Design a protein around this ligand. Structure first.
Ligand SMILES: Cn1ncc2c(NCc3cccnc3)nc(-c3cccc(NC(=S)Nc4cccc(C(F)(F)F)c4)c3)nc21
Ligand SMILES: Cn1ncc2c(NCc3cccnc3)nc(-c3cccc(NC(=S)Nc4cccc(C(F)(F)F)c4)c3)nc21
Lengths: 123, 123
């Protein structure tokens, strides 16, 4: 009886090892246990992007944003996805919104700018 | 008598293996052989970002853009650098400009969107 969190974990570790189809299956199972969690869709969206399944990534991005319109990563992956699909004007709009939200949330709450948006995040 | 190109190569391979200070030294030597090449500064800028030498990365970004105001990567690394330094409004402006230029250059010349701007570039 794995919990939805527990499943997101297993998927996150799977994703680390570039096991993307298996990681997407885990996030999918987390979504089925609790389908109103933006991050599960955001995480699976990235798996589909790595798998070059762009239509599925886009739909996951759209669902995440319906649950959480303030999501930095969902805007970013949505923009990255629309980049890969060559919807360039939409992609730029969502990328800027991702970076704008990241700044707002950094300055109101203290969040780190998500690492997905940075190429040189200190490790 | 290594050529400026030859030196950029050695630096590019060094960068692959995460040997960033040694790679920055190579790009530096390429710049000294031919200091009017935007890409050498763009490449070294990334090394400094990986080394968390933000002031040096910024200056390299600025020099690249002086040589080539149409540079996608120079705008992007400049924006990424200003992100790490928390100049958020400038960073967003340069990131959008990077993505805008990438689209223009893609649609006029056929360039791939530089991989540095994409998290899921097909390999
Ligand atoms: C949202 N934020 N703020 C801070 C921060 C962060 N700090 C530094 C860092 C950066 C990179 C690697 N290490 C540490 N790292 C990740 C982050 C980025 C990628 C992977 C993971 N790691 C695990 S296990 N799963 C995972 C797998 C695929 C996607 C995702 C996600 F969709 F969430 F990006 C998570 C964590 N994110 C972060
Ligand atoms: C500007 N564009 N368009 C297409 C393209 C590209 N295709 C796919 C790809 C993407 C990633 C890895 N493999 C293949 N890959 C790189 C690119 C990206 C990073 C590294 C390298 N590789 C070498 S050797 N040096 C190098 C080292 C540090 C920085 C840089 C640079 F500043 F140039 F980004 C180059 C090439 N760029 C690219």
């Amino acid at each position: 009886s794995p919990s939805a969190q527990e499943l997101k974990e297993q998927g996150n570790r799977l994703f680390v090892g570039r096991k993307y189809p298996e990681a997407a299956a885990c996030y999918g199972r987390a979504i089925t246990r609790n389908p109103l969690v933006a991050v599960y869709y955001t995480n699976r969206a990235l798996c589909y992007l790595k798998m070059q399944q762009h239509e599925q990534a886009l739909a996951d991005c759209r669902r995440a944003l319906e649950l959480d319109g303030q999501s930095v990563k969902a805007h970013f992956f949505l923009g990255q996805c629309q980049l890969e699909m060559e919807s360039y004007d939409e992609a730029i709009a969502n990328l800027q919104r991702a970076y704008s939200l990241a700044k707002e949330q950094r300055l109101n709450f203290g969040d780190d700018i998500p690492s997905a948006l940075r190429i040189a995040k200190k490790k």
